Amino acid sequence: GVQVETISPGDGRTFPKRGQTCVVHYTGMLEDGKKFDSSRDRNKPFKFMLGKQEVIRGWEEGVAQMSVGQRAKLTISPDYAYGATGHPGIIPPHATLVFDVELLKLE
């Protein structure tokens, strides 16, 4: 149950592929409160791979669905985010996540 609301499309030819490593820079915000998951660029963005359940689903599917050079606003729901319940530290219970991601490159 994730949505992809693009703002600045990318070429529309290259995406993350099976056997690649995405190079993304995002900022995680919540419905209308604050940041819980940011990628404070300063110390290098975030980098992950497709098919090695290292990142939530909302991403995996979301980010995939995005193209090299595109930026979007994704909306993730419990089903994909972290399941149903989370932490009382970063992920309060049923607290939908919102990511504004920029897929930069593949490695």
Catalytic residue (one of 15, 80, 82, 91): 82
Active site residue 91: no
Active site residue 37: yes
Active site residue 26: yes
Q: Which residues, 6+ apart, have CB-to-CB distance to 96 below 8 Å? A: 30, 31, 75, 76, 77, 78, 81
Q: Which tokens sit at 32?
A: 């209308």
Distance in angstroms (rounded) separating the CA atoms of residues 60 and 90: 20
Catalytic residue (one of 15, 26, 76, 80): 26
Catalytic residue (one of 15, 56, 80, 91): 56
Active site residue 82: yes
Catalytic residue (one of 7, 32, 99, 100): 99
Catalytic sites, residue numbers: 26, 36-37, 56, 82, 99
